[model samples]
Target: PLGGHTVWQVVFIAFLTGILALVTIIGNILVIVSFKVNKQLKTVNNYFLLSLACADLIIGVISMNLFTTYIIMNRWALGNLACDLWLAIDYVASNASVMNLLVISFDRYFSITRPLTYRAKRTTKRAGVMIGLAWVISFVLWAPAILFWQYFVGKRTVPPGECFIQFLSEPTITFGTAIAAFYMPVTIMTILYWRIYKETEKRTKELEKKAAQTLSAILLAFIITWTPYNIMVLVNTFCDSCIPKTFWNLGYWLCYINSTVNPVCYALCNKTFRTTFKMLLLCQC
Candidate 1:
């Protein structure tokens, strides 16, 4: 993947990747720590935020390091088992992030649309159940496929030193997973956010508008970071050589950038989280 690049170019890319990964790791850790220590953040909605941070934490901790090493080494230097494990973790963490966003969108929708009834029913137990379901669904969708696809197909798809999802060769599986992971959730989130906008517009409540604004920013960040990668994957599935390797590299990193951007979108945008993060960083908490 690092073909034809000068030493400076490689260094630049590696440096940039390292910085992004570090930010993702530290930022999500702060989010989790702030949620735990700050009483003001221990709400039902914040449970989903916690779940989302956990997923991004995995992406930062495992996925980014593995992928960066793979790129810098010019191969999957890790053995087969490590490769499979990394792929599974990457898939699960990324999928879980998207699923958590879907759950958050649903929570926001209900809060805006049926505030009285939804608030009455919204409990920590209920939020926990939804968060668990999101992770479970993400695991079920990609874990098996990543772990066992080569075994079922009865052969290795890529040679040694190269790591990739074997099932991506099958257009059916590629499209199916993409639809479930990206397209469907994005469509639902978009519709819910639109309804949220309309509802807030009708009510003209300042507080509601602020909440909607934060959620909109989160959703927009997700779309901006993830859409290009998903679109590129879909296109490459059909025409393998249609996209250049550089584009694929860019798209892949773009997806990881979502994990890095998420904390800023969801946490820093909220005053409670902002204060908690500041206090936590300053060691005043």
Candidate 2:
């Protein structure tokens, strides 16, 4: 798909993609490291962040680098088995990423709306259950579909030397998976955040207010970074030729950028994360 470009264009695209992948890797590793070394970040809430960062780390380490090579080569030189593995891993990680956010939103909502009860229930074990469920659900949603779709269809849906998701050719499957992976979770997040914002506005606690503000910023960043790519997927499902190749590539990059920007949002908004990130970055701890 990227074969029509000049040498400079290919170089520029690879450079930008490489930078995004690098930042995502470094930033999420810092998030994980700070969580491990900083006692202050061991709250049940931060556990969800750790899980989310793990998902993003997989994207940086696996999906981003694989897709970068795919775009640069404009062909699937790694063979069919490798392509299937890449598609499965990418689908699982990205779905887990969004599902983690939904879990966090629900946690925040319960904490705000039912403080006493939710506090008593918000144990480390409970958080572990939620995190475990998020990953399990994500895997259940995409892994089998990606691995067995071609077999079920009894055909090779993707052409030789071209790597694409095999299940994307069916609009019904694509729409259902898109809703499960992105749209439904996003809708729930928006609603939960709205309620959290309203509840915070009613309260007089400075801590709640700040937390609400920070979470709102994170939610906004999530919507901004992911909406384009998911929308493009839907648009392409319905009208394959409606979107240009460049725009499709841009949308894909935007989705990956969400992983890169999440830690930045946390560092900027949360005092603990900000201080811990600085200390880790400067090797001052």
Candidate 3:
């Protein structure tokens, strides 16, 4: 192990993560354009895609701050404001993404489980409500982080790109953020999705396929992209040994990479998503 990370570990970690960013940027832009350009694309459910894309676009572009940290040997260069804001953006984008996923899942659950009512109640207005709720709920959950949970009174290496007071000093805050960000949502989503799947599995063949596939795609991306980051967070929470300065730094990029996985998963599983890519999303290298 190269400091508990193999050569391939570092390479795969960074490489896959890099792909994540590239795809996130390209995919989100394409999602926006596809829905805009194609006359067939104009719909309310497209709003869900738009919301997720917007959050992802922010994450893909804004997260370069943290990614730069990894490339430069695990150091933060911005100041205290940037430090808090950096993490704040990260939390907000992540929360928004999760919230959006919940919205999407909730939509799928109802649409499949209750076909007739799904069409009636699941209109553009309801989609807007879900979108608004996602944003508001994300803001609500992460508000504390930007306030007191995370602080940056001092500077970083140069002038302090910002540094939190100390991990030990605010264990509750850290735990709260983690639980709010990862475990809580993950648990709730898993249960909700499983129930949705089970209830609708044998009802309608087409609905079952669509809902199940969508669930798999969502959960797969969430697990693959987020598991690494959450594991690292858990480790930091529990382990207090010779942890590398790069733990958070690397994990930050890994999670960023996770954002890009959705488009690819959608492309593979969802006919609409694939059509969006083929007829619209321009993949850039």
TM-scores for every predicted model:
0.93, 0.92, 0.78
Clashes of each: 0, 0, 6
Please, what are the lDDT tens digits per residue for candidate 2 over residues 23-124?
Answer: 999999988888889898887778888999999999999999998877777787888788889888998998888898898789878988998889696788
Question: What is the full ranking by TM-score, best candidate first?
Answer: 1, 2, 3
Over 1-285, each residue of candidate 1 has an lDDT whose tens digit, in order, gives 455357766688788889999999999999999988988788877888899999999999898888888777777777888888999999999999999989988998999889789977888788888999999999999889999988887877788978888888778999999999999999999999888887876887445647566766777788888999899888887886989977887788789988899898877877999988888788766
| Candidate with the greatest lDDT versus the true structure | 1
lDDT of 3 at 209: 58
lDDT of 3 by residue, 1-285 (tens): 223334555566556656666777987787777777666667775688778888888888877546554364434566556666666677788789878877777776677677787768677777788899888878876655464543354423322533542443345667776777788878877887898878776566455757777778778778877877777666776777655766665665667766677556543454665675775435532
* Candidate number with the higher TM-score (2 or 3): 2
Off by over 4 Å in 2: 1-5, 205-216
Name the Cα RMSD for model 2.
Answer: 2.5
Among all windows of 10 consecutive residues in model 1, the one with the lowest summed lDDT is 1-10
Q: Which regions of candidate 1 fall more than 4 Å away from where they truly are?
A: 1-5, 205-216, 283-285
